Subunit: 214 residues, 6 copies
């Protein structure tokens, strides 16, 4: 089952350029390569996506489950470097997924219903010694996992409506009602401007604005 | 003096389309209209900018002081409707600016060194009665004014470097050093990918991503 | 069943002048008026009681259940003005009662086991904008309802003992014991002074002192 | 100078029966007794006032300074029994006053700008051992002294206006304005009912309602 | 069953001099006295142990249950003087034990799974009146009972290993492993110094260092 | 000036065996070695003291200033391993001292008026990743330094009195008074037992009991 929701992945998988990239990645691996890309191994093609989109591995954009969605250490604010486990990784209600990277570094994601956290490899982590710093909030976030976004997802729903063929007025009627739209829709109307603002907000998130959520 | 910094305004005033819009707005008002646009009155041309960019009045993009930068009620999460003052508006260290809107509604912004807050017109405000809701956080934000963003501004600094003519490698040397760049710059290098990610992050903020900060 | 206890009503319904007023109100409505006064409608006679005693409707003083006991907006510190619900009014454990006032204003009381709260008419309330004010405590009190007084009720129990015909010494024996009273009762004895202080405390509450508890 | 304000004393000294009692107490001590009643010693006449009014010593009702106003142990919720000091009693900003009682018990009041506290006689106090009890709040109140009431005093101001000869309408004009009163004053008017409610509230406090504030 | 663990008793009952004292106390009472020492009565011989070891009664050092282990008022930081109960002493999960002392003072210990507390004789206790003092922490500790030490007990386990005949190297192998000890054991080795430090730490606790834990 | 007080050092420097060890260490270095032991370098003789007493360097027991008193990593609960500073080490009111160890590891002590903290070598520290662990309290203790013990020092004062030649009765008179001692001193007296308990408590601290305070 889908444990958690990755909002940045919901933005990225709706990017038309990423969808085109993934379909190209599938075609050259199914008809020009070794075949189908559980045992996650980052290839060279996947590292191109990490340097371009942020995900360490090309993930099917049709699937909302972010189990195999790993975010680059160069971008993630929910990752730590760990040196050398069974206690943290086997709580009834906490799952984990592993990924072997191109530089032979092992990334393990710890996730539950409250989010995810990535560990790049007892368990010891080198925390930067900065007095009165919010760098310790990473440990608090990991504890919350082992223990506006509803409006943001509604913006992505509007993008799904557009790509289905619905017009701005169609989406306006869906949100405000047929009677309100017939009475107020105009050239410089505020109902039209609100729907346009929904598109602009979501487009900015989809066109790499999701990077600011990592 | 510049009391506070409006991060959304720092994004918007760097938008090339908004800069072009403002220069067009100045030309048709200086050579085709009544002349120069302290006594802020929202005209019809200003309301077009409110429905397009979010600011209730065209503001010179060259000035960082957000004194006369007013944000639309349709977008602002720092605004309330107030019905009918001298105590709140005259604290030593708290300033205020007024704007008369096209619909004859008066908007008064209360700001200090900790941010701004807009009041749309004793003083009584109709707060929505929702049990266990964060709608009361608006009153807490107003109290904080009457009593990552350093990284976000650094992203906009990179946009200023680009518009000046500096290349991606030039900006990479500015941040990481000439020696590191000469050794590591390549086609699919991570230093080049980091600089590209800076541009993408800032571009998303500039291209209406600032709306998610209102 | 009796959900909560209104201490101010316990004081008022023990007032001999109010009891006489209610019996007069019943006689002129049962033998001179339309008959018996679930569908609470404030008449002109009830508004006389609101301007005299504080309750918006004459309530039988023999009943301790304060379901239909409504307190005047001119006196209540547990009331708000609300403009235009099913979520707040239908929690398993929270009841409500309505009253239509003489000025056609609808008062709805929301009560549970932790107290009551009155709303005078989504749901929006005009809260006075006063910085660093305890006016927001009304919302906290309403949240506590939707989520010394044992000594004060003992004082009213002493009034019930007096109206039954028990003397001050009888009540002293009831509280301190027959042996203590026989040994210590005197003209200027402290046991007699304590019982007198009980009466004075309760009489002050009954003779409009309950108004300070609204 | 007057350090603090005793609200219960402000109620009691406005009681006409207490004022008559004090004037009788002065006459029988100035023309029938030893003369004038700094060295506070509770006599037999003072103990009659303690059993009747609550103050351990007859105090001039014309003086608002509650320095020599001591409240009976039988009524005070701000008193403790102490067994056997210079550290607590000599803080720059904390004063103290002593009273020798008729039963040879010494009462010492510790007061500052935040209130008063009475000690009835190192310093050790026998606190009742009750689990999860608010009896320890007496120590917190004493710490606050060594470290609605503005509306209540306004009610007593209305009593001062009445005893000066001002009518209910005069006081209504003082609070609401001459124009409002001339327009709204009537037989069953709400402006008249509000002023009547002020009197009733204050009268209840004055007629032994202050006992509930000790 | 054993409700709680008294760490000071775990130190004292491992003291060789106390074990010798108890065996002498048993011999002179079983072959020279009245016989066997539920009804705890402190004799003169027991008071010698109170002035020497701290326990008000000689307790068999072989038993870890500290039910009858009472600590002297001259040493205990978990004791109060109480003057004159059924509510506190009969919570489902809270037990109590009584001891009659040589000076006819009754000591009652209240204990549960969270520790013990001793009362030396309603229930009233004379608390010292000291402003901003931690003397009130005794009431908080008693409330916690009515509602490093795992490392310290491991130090006493090392003493048990020594008295059984195990050498320092034997205990080193028990803690660090046979392979580590064979490789690192030397004259001035750190593994030998760590085991020596364990002994010194525990010996200090056993040789009256437990007094600092009362 | 002496910034802070090291209680464990106050115990250790009063140890007669350590004082003898230090005098032997001085004699073999002043008449058999290189001479006098600001530039702290741990020699082989100093490491013998680290494995025996805990201090990384022999310190003159006559000096109470614990500036050059360093505690072994094998014993200190106020030390961390740090990998590679000017911000933390140069606060107006925070000093630091360095020591080069026999294994070429550099130990730097950061201390102020609130205590000391040792760092064994930006600045990064490998913190053990244990969920719901008190290992993070080391960072809180370091923050407190960069931002019963009065009774324990009184116990060491009693040891100073003994080594000066004062008897147990002399110390009893010093604490309780000449009159109390002359009246109560006996064979099995409690005043004599209290003084004996002071000695036993302090002796346990001095004879390696200080290790439990590191």
């Amino acid at each position: 089952k889908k444990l958690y929701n990755d909002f940045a992945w919901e933005c990225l998988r709706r990017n038309p350029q990423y969808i085109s990239d993934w379909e190209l990645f599938m075609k050259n691996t199914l008809t020009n390569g070794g075949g189908i890309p559980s045992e996650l191994i980052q290839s060279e093609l996947d590292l191109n996506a990490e340097k371009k989109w942020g995900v360490m591995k090309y993930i099917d954009p049709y699937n909302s489950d972010p189990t195999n969605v790993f975010w680059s250490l160069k971008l993630s604010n929910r990752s730590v470097r760990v040196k050398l486990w069974g206690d943290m990784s086997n709580l009834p209600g906490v799952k984990h997924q592993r990924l072997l990277m191109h530089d032979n570094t092992l990334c393990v994601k710890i996730f539950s219903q409250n989010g995810y956290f990535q560990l790049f490899i007892x368990x010891x982590x080198x925390x930067x010694x900065x007095x009165x710093x919010x760098x310790x909030x990473x440990x608090x976030x990991x504890x919350x996992x082992x223990x506006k976004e509803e409006q943001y997802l509604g913006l992505l729903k509007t993008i799904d409506d557009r790509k289905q063929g619905f017009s701005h007025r169609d989406i306006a009627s869906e949100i405000f009602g047929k009677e309100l739209v017939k009475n107020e829709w105009s050239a410089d109307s505020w109902v039209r401007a609100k729907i346009r603002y929904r598109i602009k907000k979501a487009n900015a998130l989809i066109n790499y604005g999701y990077l600011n959520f990592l």
